Design a protein around this ligand. Sequence first.
Ligand SMILES: Nc1ncnc2c1ncn2[C@@H]1O[C@H](COP(=O)(O)OP(=O)(O)O)[C@@H](O)[C@H]1O
Ligand SMILES: Nc1ncnc2c1ncn2[C@@H]1O[C@H](COP(=O)(O)OP(=O)(O)O)[C@@H](O)[C@H]1O
Ligand SMILES: Nc1ncnc2c1ncn2[C@@H]1O[C@H](COP(=O)(O)OP(=O)(O)O)[C@@H](O)[C@H]1O
Ligand SMILES: Nc1ncnc2c1ncn2[C@@H]1O[C@H](COP(=O)(O)OP(=O)(O)O)[C@@H](O)[C@H]1O
Ligand SMILES: Nc1ncnc2c1ncn2[C@@H]1O[C@H](COP(=O)(O)OP(=O)(O)O)[C@@H](O)[C@H]1O
Ligand SMILES: CN(CC(=O)O)C(=N)N
Ligand SMILES: CN(CC(=O)O)C(=N)N
Ligand SMILES: CN(CC(=O)O)C(=N)N
Ligand SMILES: CN(CC(=O)O)C(=N)N
Ligand SMILES: CN(CC(=O)O)C(=N)N
Ligand SMILES: [Mg+2]
Ligand SMILES: [Mg+2]
Ligand SMILES: [Mg+2]
Ligand SMILES: [Mg+2]
Ligand SMILES: [Mg+2]
Lengths: 359, 359, 359, 359, 359
Amino acid sequence: SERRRLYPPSAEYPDLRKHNNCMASHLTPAVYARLCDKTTPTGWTLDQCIQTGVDNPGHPFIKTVGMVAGDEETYEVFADLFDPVIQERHNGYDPRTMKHTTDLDASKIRSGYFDERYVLSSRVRTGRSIRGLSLPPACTRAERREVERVVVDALSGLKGDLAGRYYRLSEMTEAEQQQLIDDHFLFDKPVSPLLTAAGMARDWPDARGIWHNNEKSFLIWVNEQDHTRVISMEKGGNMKRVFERFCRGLKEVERLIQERGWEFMWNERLGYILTCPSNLGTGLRAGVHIKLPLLSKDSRFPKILENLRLQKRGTGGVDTAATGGVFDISNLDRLGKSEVELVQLVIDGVNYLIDCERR
Amino acid sequence: SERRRLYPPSAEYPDLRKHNNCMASHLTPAVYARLCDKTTPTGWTLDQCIQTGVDNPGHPFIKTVGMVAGDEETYEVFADLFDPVIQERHNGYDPRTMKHTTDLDASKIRSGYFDERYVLSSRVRTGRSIRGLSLPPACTRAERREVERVVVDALSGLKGDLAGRYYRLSEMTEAEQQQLIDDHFLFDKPVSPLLTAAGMARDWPDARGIWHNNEKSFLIWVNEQDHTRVISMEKGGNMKRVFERFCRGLKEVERLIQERGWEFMWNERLGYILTCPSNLGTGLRAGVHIKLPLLSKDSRFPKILENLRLQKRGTGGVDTAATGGVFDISNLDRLGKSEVELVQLVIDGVNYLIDCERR
Amino acid sequence: SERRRLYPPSAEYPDLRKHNNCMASHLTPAVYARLCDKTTPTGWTLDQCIQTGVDNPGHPFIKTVGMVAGDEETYEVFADLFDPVIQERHNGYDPRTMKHTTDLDASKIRSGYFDERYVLSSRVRTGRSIRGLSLPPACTRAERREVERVVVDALSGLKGDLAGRYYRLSEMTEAEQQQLIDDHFLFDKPVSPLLTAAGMARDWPDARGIWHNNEKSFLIWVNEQDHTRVISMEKGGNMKRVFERFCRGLKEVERLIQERGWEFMWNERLGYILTCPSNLGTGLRAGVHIKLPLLSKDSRFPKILENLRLQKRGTGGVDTAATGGVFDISNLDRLGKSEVELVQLVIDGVNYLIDCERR
Amino acid sequence: SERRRLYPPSAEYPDLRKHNNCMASHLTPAVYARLCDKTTPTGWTLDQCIQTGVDNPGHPFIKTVGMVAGDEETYEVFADLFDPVIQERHNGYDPRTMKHTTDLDASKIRSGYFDERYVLSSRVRTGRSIRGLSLPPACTRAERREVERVVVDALSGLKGDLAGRYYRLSEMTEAEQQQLIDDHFLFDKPVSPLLTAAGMARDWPDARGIWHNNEKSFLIWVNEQDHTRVISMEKGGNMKRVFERFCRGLKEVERLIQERGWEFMWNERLGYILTCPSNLGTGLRAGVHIKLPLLSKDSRFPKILENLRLQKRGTGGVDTAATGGVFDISNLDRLGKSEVELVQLVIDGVNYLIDCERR
Amino acid sequence: SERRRLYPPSAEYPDLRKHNNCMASHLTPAVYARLCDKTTPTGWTLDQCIQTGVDNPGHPFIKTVGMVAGDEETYEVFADLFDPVIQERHNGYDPRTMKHTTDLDASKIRSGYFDERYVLSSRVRTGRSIRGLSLPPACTRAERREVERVVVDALSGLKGDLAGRYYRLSEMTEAEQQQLIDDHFLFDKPVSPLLTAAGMARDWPDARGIWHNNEKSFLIWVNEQDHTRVISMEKGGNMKRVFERFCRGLKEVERLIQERGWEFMWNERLGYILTCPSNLGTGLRAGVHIKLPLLSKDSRFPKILENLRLQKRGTGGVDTAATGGVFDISNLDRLGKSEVELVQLVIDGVNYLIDCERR
Ligand SMILES: Nc1ncnc2c1ncn2[C@@H]1O[C@H](COP(=O)(O)OP(=O)(O)O)[C@@H](O)[C@H]1O
Ligand SMILES: Nc1ncnc2c1ncn2[C@@H]1O[C@H](COP(=O)(O)OP(=O)(O)O)[C@@H](O)[C@H]1O
Ligand SMILES: Nc1ncnc2c1ncn2[C@@H]1O[C@H](COP(=O)(O)OP(=O)(O)O)[C@@H](O)[C@H]1O
Ligand SMILES: Nc1ncnc2c1ncn2[C@@H]1O[C@H](COP(=O)(O)OP(=O)(O)O)[C@@H](O)[C@H]1O
Ligand SMILES: Nc1ncnc2c1ncn2[C@@H]1O[C@H](COP(=O)(O)OP(=O)(O)O)[C@@H](O)[C@H]1O
Ligand SMILES: CN(CC(=O)O)C(=N)N
Ligand SMILES: CN(CC(=O)O)C(=N)N
Ligand SMILES: CN(CC(=O)O)C(=N)N
Ligand SMILES: CN(CC(=O)O)C(=N)N
Ligand SMILES: CN(CC(=O)O)C(=N)N
Ligand SMILES: [Mg+2]
Ligand SMILES: [Mg+2]
Ligand SMILES: [Mg+2]
Ligand SMILES: [Mg+2]
Ligand SMILES: [Mg+2]
């Protein structure tokens, strides 16, 4: 009969004593019990949200979040757990009291030029989901293929310097993909436990690819970690030009996507909705590489970085260490501030770092 | 299991880039997604509402609405889409803030006499639904037959000059129906794509007919485009008399219909509920034919017509062009203003047109 | 409460006294009552099946069926009504006792050459549905677009003489489409009441097009009346060559469609499932045009045609009359016999007609 | 409404053109469509069954199955797909026509002694599930903890030479676990994509451990890849003694588990139910290491191995290559034959290999 | 969501290692798992059936069954567990292969007279349920009151020597009830754990009472342990007369109960349905007291008793020991054999015991 009893929520509670994710810092038995039975309309559950954080006590190179979203409803169905995490992840930003404003106008940028001797590369990046389609962690094969078709068709309409063709991973050979990776264009097959535990590596490489303009200064990653990933790169230190191309291409892509009736996932309290709560808000991760020896003279590096709200990864990916001195220095926060604001902050921070080389 | 995913709403969104209906001007992906799952208690869905507008980019002779209603709940279940369309269709009339008043008293009419040399014919028209019965676009065979029986029985009680018999289309021969059509009494079999796409031509001619008084000055169309269509005609220019007969017969029909327990569909925010949102409000389309050469001297005709809120169709139906000069000039708006007001407006407008003949 | 009563089935029964479809000849109140409540898993109902036959008493040029299918389940959910109709439509073929065999090998063809002076054109045709997708009468916009994408992608893999590109109707201009029509390649916009009543003209021209090889001797119609329509044409009388190309291209298309995981709708009792029960079985309609005066010497034409199981339409479509003498003479039955058998029958019949010209 | 359509099954079908699992060799669109909607009572779906095979085209060292089970119902709910795979995996064994017999009596063993100079190590292994508890691929945290408690309590009752204590992975230090691994006692953290794709690495290391007797000749792995894994090891070539201890301890464990009311999952058609269909039947993988140079003189090794139904992995795990010559040679089939039969087959095969060293 | 898992059946399995009921001898984890979810239409579950046996390892004076029924469906809903227990309880009587015959004709009795010096008292007893009313273990207050009213009204119609009035326990004083108890007429308040664990003591003494004829030779117990308990007593050894009165009164009670439309629970495979499976079949427990010293000369008493299928309780109830020598000797089996057969067996057995006094 219905007299049969279920396992009490505490019987399922994760053992997070040794873990260090930002999820474990905020998952309490009360919250887990509250959300144990809920679910998003597509079947996403809390356990699926917190699985990746549960499996990984921490990351060797940078503090993580520990949870991913399955669709747009997750950020509201499971808000009670997420909002404290989003607040902690983005320094002092309540995701239930204040709103988020997005400005993609590069005309307001200042300076934007780095000492080419010290910065080498200049990149900007973002991401965009498609409403009505499950996010990569939870998306089925059909949903992923639908995302791929929508973006491929929409991007086919781009004209001018932002013109190219879409190369599907299933077509590229190992050598070509490896060359694109080593060139810092393509994305790597997901082997990190933080991605495979979240479910973002199912059915690889099906329905995933890259669309890059002829000069490869404007790239789009389809179905790697997010639905979309709009990158603009230029080997140099003219952040202004790369950012200008990035925003122009972003506006064009948005136009050509809405022309077909689709719309990018978005809500006022959060901005563009992305899988990992780290990327919430603007998704923007404007940043540069750095000449090794010039910035290799750094004693209190992490303290200054934290003061400047800058992340320090390795040249080769977040999952790699910095060798020789080349530090992939990017911005930390993505939500709350606007894209122009974040890029100006990155410009000021990197210029400050250059001024502090003091060889 | 239930893990199977549905086609996202955008995957169904219509391709209305080239269309020009008033539906396409107001259907946005947000609205379509919102109403994608809803339905009226009888099974009417949004796609069924917008199908006719989807199929027809536009009409060669006059701007259209593009959607039809299935029953009375449609105007509330799918209000989010309709209300902007009703507002645009009837110049500046919010269907969710202001109310509608109906006055069917011809004693307040003034003048009402046209120059017979220039107007030829004088007609008034309206329509009336029956509560509890699905509208023609969605009505089943049994519902249509029930409507026919209700109106036939109720109208059988009419006495006096408004006295006649009901001729069922299934009984009339081709010659008789053709003569009535060419005489401007009967209605034509639905062949226009704007009607067949809406579903108002199923099971033709079953359960449809005409009831005309002995002098044919008072006609009722049963189950052609609406449940009811109460027309009063007189070959001449005495709009006052035709309108007086129209309102008197309308009151008598209403009385004899309520006597049996039925009631005409009606709500304060909209007035009498009719299929095509063009006819909402009063359903009244008082108008006249016109002598050709006298009004054939017109240079800026459409501008003056739009100024006077008058529609210009052809002598033979909205689906026909005006040849020789005979312009079927009627009123445009039906909701917001009262029947007496609309008829007085038509009188003033047509008299103004006559005064502007200036041969 | 639930004490409320529904309209009895007889209250909905269609008035088919004057109609002449093959549906009306077999729809009885018992059958209508039995299937009144049933439905296919996708929502297809009996009334939707019989609507087109209800609306059209008959066709001016050839006897019709009167019903269409919504998906593959319809032929089993509503079998009680269909099977007598399929039996009558295809002379003496029970669709519930005997099986259907399909053979698409042109190597077994004999003769295959006509007197070019008398036949002019040589065409073969068929159709193919996609499993899991609703048929054109019932298909939604998303389903139609999915069909279009599946066939476009699959056909893109064709190589050799069967090589071309897919032209979408939304792209072709009016002049180009008209030229293709008059050339007997493209299909006409649906205006016939027998098609618009069935619902096969919704959302026109969205998601519909034609893929023709470079020489246009191999064409595919996407989303006009069926999911697929594989035509092979050659202006001449070498039926053998056109049929060989037709079958080879059909096999290649099937291969390239299954490569992606899809499959053509098919069951042993019926063969390939198509919308109009006339086309059930093989869908094959091999036939030729005819020189006018040579076959204009015919006294008892319909009797001989019925003897030979050949249909006689007009040069320009089934919805047109034969003028000058050019008679579009094709085969009647499609189910029960195999494609090779039907084509050999057409060859023998047309050769017999030529032998009977007897000028 | 319910008129909304689902993604057709083919729209979800995996792209297995390049894959080489035994799953892809037998997954057809018909089967996938048939089982697309089904599910086991605990929520296991077909996509979850085939995910691991989908993600991995193949394994570098040995042919795989490609699917895992979620519970005991999976082998019946999804039988249509599994049974051909089980038939192929275990040479010519229909899992729906013939039955399986298990005999765990070592008294019937013959010889059982190897040339210690050539075999080094002698091990036997198996596995056992617990009825009512979800298998590791699908098990929740509470279910895994319940399994751990059941086995820990039951095994606590063992007495005699089969006496020890249970060490929980969460307690062991990195050095101790590494030493046990290198000693060939403990299991390695799951990093192989064939295990992480299946979901058998969630919540690691929670609720997992090893129970080994004082001499470590009898080990039990709790919650690594199966519920249970009963290994008996002895550095030498006396397979008879190790197998005797293995079967005696297995019988004792079964007794002490049923004493508490639990029961090992088991059905006649399949024997003990285990996750990977490779291990179905008896779970037994009796096998030995081998001296390198003595068997390094091998030309047509794989042909003889296939003739002898023996698998050849590396000394260090299936996920490692054989270096120096030490070949981890085990038995292939597990279902159909009995444990005594399989062990005798391994004995004969390894003795044959020794006789064929022919230095 | 529904992903939450229930406690596996084994997690609920009772700990019956030390118990000795006939339930524990036949409850296996397979059976418990099978019936874990089932239930009778009134909500009776297996756990409720086996609770009393679980709580009581055994009875000090006689072997028990360990389970009770909640209604008539229990013996079919939970037949898998009961049937072996009924088979063991009633020596060699399958409750699913053979049928039961009831004969209540005392005219076929022989002898029926005991040596008054050795037997003292002569009693017969039975019980009868009311169809449609839950049995005492599961009955609610309203159901118990309904049973009481039905039996009181039906018995009010008795006339002749079987004539009396019904005394309600709520009306009797402590002294009167105690005197009736010590006189061996009334029943004792339930304090034995074997009754209170079953739930047959709820709401005591509400809705329970005794109806005894004027001479108290015919008594009926209402709502003590069963719905009905029809006892006939006579201080003496004329079993024939007491049994004759018992059967006559039973027939009269049955008649007067069916007159009102009710019916005694009964099925062919089991006979009259009673709570404790010990009483199944006829419910008959004809038996006598015994003079102490005459039968106090007994060495192998239990062996002879088991040979003769006779139970030996104490003078004062089954929950009391036999002191002085007065042994309440009754019959054991109730199902399979008929009432006349059982009474003749008791007569023969007690006469045999008297013959074996051999003082
Ligand atoms: N500033 C940069 N210049 C050049 N390449 C970059 C830069 N930032 C990231 N990349 C490239 O992106 C890939 C992975 O980026 P990652 O560190 O994961 O950032 P994100 O998550 O924003 O993509 C690597 O191949 C790396 O070469
Ligand atoms: N003023 C008029 N005089 C005569 N006939 C008219 C007039 N207005 C409309 N009709 C008749 O109405 C029929 C269709 O009119 P239509 O344009 O559909 O107006 P409505 O939509 O109000 O019916 C035609 O057959 C036409 O003869
Ligand atoms: N034998 C033929 N030769 C040339 N054109 C043909 C032939 N048969 C059909 N057509 C063309 O097909 C179009 C419509 O064909 P239709 O009569 O509807 O046959 P189907 O239903 O098989 O398509 C017309 O434009 C017509 O020109
Ligand atoms: N015959 C053997 N002798 C010694 N160690 C073994 C033997 N077989 C397996 N192992 C040990 O088992 C571990 C993994 O075994 P694996 O190849 O996964 O087999 P299984 O799947 O049966 O556990 C390794 O650490 C390996 O050292
Ligand atoms: N042969 C008998 N003579 C007198 N009283 C009896 C006899 N058998 C039973 N009783 C009375 O029945 C009561 C309980 O009997 P019990 O052992 O429960 O038998 P049952 O289960 O058939 O009622 C006691 O109070 C006892 O006095
Ligand atoms: C690197 N990140 C960001 C994070 O989780 O903090 C990934 N989600 N992979
Ligand atoms: C002519 N009209 C009015 C309209 O749609 O605007 C019809 N609904 N047919
Ligand atoms: C011409 N046909 C065939 C038929 O219906 O008989 C169409 N279904 N349109
Ligand atoms: C090594 N195996 C066996 C197999 O899948 O064939 C695992 N299931 N991991
Ligand atoms: C004495 N009995 C009989 C039995 O359970 O065996 C009771 N059910 N109380
Ligand atoms: Mg990255
Ligand atoms: Mg009209
Ligand atoms: Mg055609
Ligand atoms: Mg292993
Ligand atoms: Mg008793």
